[PDB]
Design a protein around this ligand. Structure first.
Ligand SMILES: [Mg+2]
Ligand SMILES: [Mg+2]
Lengths: 182, 357
């Protein structure tokens, strides 16, 4: 899964999340074509009979969450990330950090995240204070004994007041932001 | 650089060589969609484990101009031979994720190329020889691999060893290290062919047929028919308001939009910024909130052409209030079931709630 974003001088805004699922997908490479092939159908439920059971011609449920945020009919921010089912949680947290904490965009991105889907799945980014993790686990959580990076937000903020775009690439990988003038 | 500012465009992507080329496209007057397309090909070559024309995507765009917002939904579809229980062994037991993950049954009909064509034509104003050519150069003449790619190839030696991939990502018995030059001659072949005869190399060509071969060679049920049938779809966003902003996100068949909005709706009333960002309080309310939303996702989320997702119910003001009951600072909820959002939307589930592992 990767997420990227683009903004032009004629107002268009692109938030694009996109994947082959697992890294290298199934691993399969179309022979003598070099093309890697997705395992996406394993996003479908294994035991059948629920909303997200396998069906011919059906699409398996995704977690992808490319987003654009608008203040006053006009798009001001763009957010998205990879990270499997943790995506929902990354974007959620990025938006909180940026709009509820009033953090800079990069700061909101970099600010350590958690993720937890059930009582048996917990992850946290390095930065979670130890005293705090400990006191959480006393309370009934299961943040394990060592951290992991969660997700990869790329994002552009649209600055009317200064008439520019500010683009940021999450540190989790070697991504990059660059703007164009003239 | 990881942070930077510009007047007339901005591109931000996962790979430095993918950023780069989109920017070039904007500098030569190409629009954001043109550039996005270019980037996706570039990422396919430079970040091959992550994104690809052998996969799916969701492309959200704000228009010009018309000021409407839409999504090019190029998510893969299951071939007609797929079956609800294809992921069980003969004993009715779920097949190991490691096993399901490499099998032909896992492969959905790739839609990314069809999605690029949809986007370009709607908002395209370039090409369609220009935006894949620079990717052809990187595939043909190669580029040095970054750490993320280097690690991916190391961390997945064994999956890649079993496929045609091993020839080129596992040159002899080892995997390329950071800085090694990655050449994808065959991928360049395919990319050149994409530009020349258009997409239908893929949905009606060698390529489509060749994929049908391999999916079956690995156990899967994909035919060239399936590939010829595939078409992307356009979605209008799911919307939300939060903190006086207006949010456009992905609707079903993604779980992302609904539950990220629900996550915000749940957490909004808690005025989180009262607490320090690295405090017990924040973490606990986040954790509790995630449990609720993720439970809802596991019970109610699927492709809406086939199922009913209570979008209205899952975000109902009174539903949110009900569920927010279950989120306190004075203990952790251990009773983490799905809510009943159906009590707030008109309908009934056309499916059950089935546990997964
Ligand atoms: Mg506030
Ligand atoms: Mg980070």
């Amino acid at each position: 899964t990767t997420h990227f974003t683009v903004t032009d001088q004629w107002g268009n805004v692109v938030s694009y999340t996109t994947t082959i699922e697992q890294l290298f997908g199934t691993g399969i490479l179309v022979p003598g074509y070099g093309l890697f092939l997705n395992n996406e159908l394993t996003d479908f439920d294994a035991i059948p009979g629920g909303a997200n059971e396998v069906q011919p011609n059906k699409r398996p449920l995704s977690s992808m969450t490319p987003t654009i945020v608008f203040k006053d009919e006009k798009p001001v921010l763009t957010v998205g990330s990879p990270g499997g089912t943790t995506i929902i949680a990354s974007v959620f947290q990025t938006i909180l950090n940026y709009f509820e904490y009033g953090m800079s965009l990069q700061d909101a991105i970099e600010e350590p995240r958690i993720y937890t889907n059930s009582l048996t799945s917990y992850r946290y980014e390095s930065g979670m204070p130890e005293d705090v993790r400990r006191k959480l686990n006393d309370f009934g959580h299961k943040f394990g004994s060592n951290p992991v990076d969660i997700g990869n937000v790329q994002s552009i903020f649209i600055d009317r007041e200064n008439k520019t775009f500010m683009g940021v690439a999450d540190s989790s990988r070697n991504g990059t932001a660059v703007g164009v003038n003239i | 650089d990881k942070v930077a500012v510009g007047k007339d465009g901005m591109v931000a992507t996962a790979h430095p060589l993918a950023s780069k080329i989109g920017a070039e496209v904007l500098k030569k007057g190409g629009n954001a969609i043109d550039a996005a397309i270019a980037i996706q090909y570039a990422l396919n070559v430079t970040e091959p484990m992550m994104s690809g024309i052998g996969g799916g995507g969701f492309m959200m765009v704000y228009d010009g101009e018309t000021k409407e917002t839409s999504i090019i939904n190029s998510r893969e579809r299951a071939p007609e031979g797929a079956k609800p229980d294809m992921f069980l062994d003969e004993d009715g037991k779920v097949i190991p994720f490691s096993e399901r993950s490499r099998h032909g049954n896992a492969v959905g009909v790739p839609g990314t190329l069809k999605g690029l064509e949809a986007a370009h034509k709607k908002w395209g104003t370039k090409k369609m020889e220009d935006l894949i050519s620079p990717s052809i150069k990187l595939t043909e003449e190669g580029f040095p691999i970054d750490s993320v790619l280097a690690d991916a190839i190391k961390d997945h030696q064994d999956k890649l060893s079993k496929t045609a991939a091993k020839d080129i990502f596992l040159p002899d018995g080892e995997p390329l290290k950071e800085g090694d030059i990655l050449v994808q001659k065959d991928m360049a072949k395919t990319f050149k062919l994409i530009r020349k005869e258009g997409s239908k190399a893929f949905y009606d060509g060698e390529i489509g047929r060749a994929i049908a071969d391999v999916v079956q060679d690995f156990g899967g049920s994909m035919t060239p028919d399936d590939l010829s049938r595939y078409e992307v779809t356009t979605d209008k966003p799911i919307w939300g308001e939060y903190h006086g902003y207006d949010i456009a996100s992905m609707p079903p068949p993604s779980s992302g939009g609904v539950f990220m909005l629900q996550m915000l709706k749940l957490i909004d009333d808690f005025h989180l910024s009262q607490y320090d960002p690295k405090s017990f309080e924040k973490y606990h309310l986040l954790a509790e909130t995630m449990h609720l939303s993720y439970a809802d996702r596991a019970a109610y989320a699927g492709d809406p052409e086939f199922v009913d997702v209570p979008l209205r119910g899952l975000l109902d003001p009174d539903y949110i209030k009900e569920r927010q009951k279950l989120i306190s600072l004075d203990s952790m909820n251990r009773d983490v079931k799905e809510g009943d959002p159906w009590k707030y939307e008109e309908g009934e589930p056309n499916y059950e709630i089935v546990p997964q592992p």
